[PDB]
Structure formats: C-alpha cells, structure tokens
Nucleic acid binder design. Sequence first.
DNA 1: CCCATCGTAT
DNA 2: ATACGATGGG
Length: 758
Amino acid sequence: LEAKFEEASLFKRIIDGFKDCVQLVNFQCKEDGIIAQAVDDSRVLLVSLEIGVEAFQEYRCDHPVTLGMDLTSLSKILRCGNNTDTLTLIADNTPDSIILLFEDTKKDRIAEYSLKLMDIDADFLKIEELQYDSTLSLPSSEFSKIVRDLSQLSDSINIMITKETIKFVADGDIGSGSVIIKPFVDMEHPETSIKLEMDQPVDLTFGAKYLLDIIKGSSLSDRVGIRLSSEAPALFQFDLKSGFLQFFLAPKLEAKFEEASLFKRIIDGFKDCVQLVNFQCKEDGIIAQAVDDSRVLLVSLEIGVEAFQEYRCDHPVTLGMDLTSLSKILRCGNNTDTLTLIADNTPDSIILLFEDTKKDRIAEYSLKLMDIDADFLKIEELQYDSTLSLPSSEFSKIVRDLSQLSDSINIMITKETIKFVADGDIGSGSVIIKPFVDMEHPETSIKLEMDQPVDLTFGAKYLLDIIKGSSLSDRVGIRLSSEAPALFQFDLKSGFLQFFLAPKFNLEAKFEEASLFKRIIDGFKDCVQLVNFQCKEDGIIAQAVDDSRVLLVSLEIGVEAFQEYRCDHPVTLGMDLTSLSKILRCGNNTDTLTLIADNTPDSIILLFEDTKKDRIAEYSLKLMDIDADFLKIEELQYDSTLSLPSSEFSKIVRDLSQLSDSINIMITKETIKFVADGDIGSGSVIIKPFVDMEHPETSIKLEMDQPVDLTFGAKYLLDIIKGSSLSDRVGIRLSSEAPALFQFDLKSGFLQFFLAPK
DNA sequence: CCCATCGTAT
DNA sequence: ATACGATGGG
C-alpha cells in the first residue's frame, strides 16, 4: 500500500471531521480506494468515509489491507509537517505499524512518522438508499451555526421540511428557537446557495449531542448535504473530491433595533454583575435597574425611543428576564441583523426576531419570562465634587492593568491631575493621566471638572464589572463625590448606562521599545521562576539554574540595546518573573520602558511612558533575595554546531513532543535528524543544510568535527524554543562530554540555554 | 469597505 | 483548546 495526498492538509481535514465521536476505526484499503466506518460510544451515530482513487495524487494498493488505528494518535501525527507538504501513507502486506511520510516541495525537510496499528473488529456496512423523503444542501457554515445555536436551548433539535421551506426548531426550559431558511441559488457565489428537493415533507427530531458531532465535518466541505426520511436514518454528507464523509443518524409592544449588536452590547454590560432584571417598557422607551449580589453596585439603563429603528407600546409592560438565558439567545445569528422584541398583553414570554440583511435568512426565539419584584429604589439628589470623562478603552485598560496588583483601586483627583493607584502583595502601580483637549482625535480628549479634591477607593471586583459597558460608548463619564456614590456612565444614542458604586475604607535604563524587554522575559520565564538581574555599567546580565539543575539560562543585554543607559553603582535586582510578567503585560509594547533603582535597592521601578502623551504608568515590583548560582567556566571544543530558523526548530520540537518525553538529536555529515520514539508511535524529522541567497534567514548551517547522538528531555526543549521570539535563528552547539548550547542572539545581547543531555 | 466564518498554528 | 490570520460574503 502506497497512497499520497497532494496536500497533507486534506487528510488532516478528513480525520478532524469525525475524530471527536469515535476513538477507534478501521481503514479498509482496496484497489478502488480507502474506506472507513465506525459508530460513536452510544452506537447510534454511524460514520462512513469513502476516499476514491481520484482523491489522491498517486494511489497503489497491491493487496487489500485493513488498517485499524487510534484517531487521537493519528491526529497527533497529522499536526506535524507543514500542511503544504506531500503526505504519503505506506503499509506493508502484513503491517505491524503504518508509516506516514511528509515532504515539502524542496528536499530541505523530510518528516517520517510511524503509528502502531491495532486489532479492531470491523465489518464495513456498505449501504446507502435510493429514496429520501427530502433532500437539501446548505453551506456547512450556516448549518454548523444553526446547530450550535439551538443546542443552547434544547437537547433535541427538530428539522421540518415543506416546499420552499427549511425550519430548524428547538424547545427547552429557558425558551425556544426556530430558524427558517428558503431555497435560493446565488449565481455569483454558488457556495452559499441552498438546494431543496422535497418528495414529501418531514418532521424528524435529532439529538443535539449527535448534530454537534456531525457539524465538525465542515472541515472537509464548504457545503453539507442532508437527506431525510421518515423510514430511514438521516444522511449528513460532506463531499470531497472523489469521495465523501457520511454521518447516519436515526430520528427520535414591539421594539426594533437597526443593529442587533446594540442590545447585545447592553446586556453584556449588565450580565456578570447582575443576575436577573425587570425591563420596564413604556411609550417613552425602556428602563431597567439592577443591583449586584452584595447590593453595592447599582446598574441603571435608560433606552430612549430614538435609539430604536422603530418602537411602539400600547401599554406599560414589565419583562422579567434571566440575563444568562437572554445572552444565550442573543448569541445568534448576526450582530448586524434586525432585532425585534414582541410581547403580548399578558406576557408569558418575550419573542426576539432576528432578521438578516438578506431577505431569505430568518430566525426567531422565545424567552420564558421570570417573576421579579421592582421595589424598592430611591435616588436622592446627588452632588459631586469632581467630574471627568475619558476614552472608555483607556479607562478599561487602566482598570484591567491595575486589577492585576490589588483587589482595591484608588482614584485620586487633584487640580489638573487624575491618579489611579493599586497596592498589592507583589507591588504597587499608579497611572497618572493629565487633562488635555485635542483638536485632532478630539474623541481621545480628557476632560476634568473638579470643584474639590477627591480620594476614593473601590473594589477592583466592581470596576471590572463597570468596564463591561465600554462597548457602548467611545467615552465614559465619572462623577466622584466623597459622600455620594461614584457614578460611571456610558452615553448611548438617546440613552445611557449608569453604574452607582460604593467606596471602601483602607540605575536608569530606558528601552527603545518596551516590547523588547517583555519578549525577553517571556523567553525564559518558563525555565526559571526566580532570577537575579545583575546590572553593571556595561549592561544587564542574568544567570539562573532551575531546581532540577539540568538547565542553565544565561541572559545578557548590552548598553547598545537601550535607548539610554546609566549605572552609577552596580545593583542586583532579584525578581519573581511571574510577578514581573503581570507588570510587563500592562504597559503597551510601543510605550517607553524605563527601569529605575536607587543605590540601596528594596524595590525596582518599571516606568511606562507615552510618546506625545502626558500619560505615565509607573509600576513597582518588590525585590527578593535570590542566592546566586555557582558558575562553571568551561572552554571546550564542541562535536557539532548548527544554526537554523528558530521558527522551524520550534515547530520540529513541538511536533515531536507529542510523541515522547525524549527527543534525540543526531548529527551526521550533511544531515540533521530529530527523533522522538514514544508509545503510540515514533516520528522522525530529517533536515539537510543549505544556503539561500535571497532569504538568508531560512538557511541551515552545519559544521561537524564528529557525529553526535544526544537525547534531551522534551520538557526542557519546549522551554528553550520559547526564545524564538528573540531571534529568527537559533545556534546549537552539541558535545558528548559537554552540555548542549542553545543560543539566541539579540541586538547587542543574547540568551543562552545550556541543557544537559539525558 | 466592513463583518463574519473557517482554517491553521501555537 | 484558544487565538490569530485569511478568505468569502454582504
């Protein structure tokens, strides 16, 4: 047996389609192609795969062989090798195992993986039918969605077919939903058209669980054939060039929004901080008020009529809703669709009617209403000391960033100064924004209307619930009083979302691009948890050995890597990288990162600055005593030295790590061989040296004094490859009497990984 | 031109 | 399993 796909992606796309509902299947190979068939765990969902000869680039099957294998294992081997490589299945007349063989256009890379076959009882039932009461084909896209959606309402979906009508229906405890589509043919984009041939209407019901499995076949085809019958199992078929994948399954007040996205955005700001709320509807619009569990955060929404494309009310109605169930319905289908809220005189439930831009596509849902009491709420006239407004996206960042440090955030308002502060166990953090009016980008202006200084503390828990409404307005209004609740408002067109909140009672090294130091720390934060940052007049260096003592990480950042550098006195900054990460994530990758430390260091200062903005985010990490490591100065001669793209070396490692906990590197003349041999099967990657003038960063240099054959723990190599963010290339020095060297050369710096072979 | 969906990679 | 990128459709 020898069958090669032109594109390895194809075979991956096939396996992925049915790999989640079957653990073990048999592939019966014949002269006329490959075929497979299996059932799910419950044994009601039958899957059948047929791959004809014309589906391959080359197919040769000496003798009918049956290949039983575990899809989990196979799919792991299918993740390997670029999806543009030529995949080739090879099996002997009596196979102990099957051999997969990847090969790109060039001869540079050659991947050969082997999987161990199994003994399965396979009787391929080759059976389809001639007559289905109805037959239809729709984009597997639209279908996958329809199913994923109605699966939130019920455990059983229902398909109902009539002439020129396809109706999917679901009924559950929270509510019901029905999607009606009609047959149409698109001349310009046929891949979106809907075919329907009805010999006779059908009203079959199918378990949602199985449909959820079936829709995974969308990875093979842009379309999905469905054949229904009141006497036969339904046929869900995904066609592929010269073949197909089949799933056989046996049946069992009106307020209209121009954009549906608005209502979603509103509910999003509501949920997560409030459970259920009464939507009070009147002729002048809709209002809703809810408090959080602890009753310290009040949410006040007011939607004016002008916010609707069309709005009408005969009489005031109150709709009690569970925002969780509500958001489930709001999930689908399109954000741009026309949303409409219908309700009868004595509302037992509310009906949401989604309508696409296309006249054809329709979807309506019905949410069962709750019973909630409104009383009692009273808002005394509130006077505020300070009043500011700023880009919601900016305020959102500040909150999210500072939330990382403390469970409490402090807002301080002084004359022409707004200071956000958070103080936690690892260290503090303060962002200081300055009021300014900008003619260009006037939306990003920071207004301040202060009558008297204010110092208020809030639980980060609640500020994170407030920033949820940032999707409603470019800006956010903040009224702050010392005796009144803090008010956070998001302005809608003809409306608003308000949040009432109750207070609480409690060395100079400037990086050109902050992102640089961030990707550096990410390069070895997984290898070592605690590390000293020794700072000298010539730059920053760090040596660290993990607890296992097998890996040595050597960092070095030269002065030429900074936009500015000063060192009056050699300082050492012992830091917890896990802490340093949280802080490095806050500031922008483009912002200027300045490290500041006093002569007698107790803490380090990380300073994030903007280009033309007064905005300054200063952070502070608490240092800790880390005992330095014992340095071994080894000057030796390696057996072999190779350099390759760190992007390639990374893929190679991640691919083989799936097979074994050990990866063997074996250098021979003009050949580099990476081999992982695990239980499920052994995979092997073989690269060859070559130079490419046009693109030098794709070359592979290989100098060898003597063949090498070392094994490294995949656990460690997975950490070493994370330096691929620092350099396009990775240096590899290998020796039999010495630890391997993995080097990533930065600009005016480097990151060395000295790993010890097993 | 913008938005949504699907596929691929990490 | 999640995130990012690319392609297709509206």
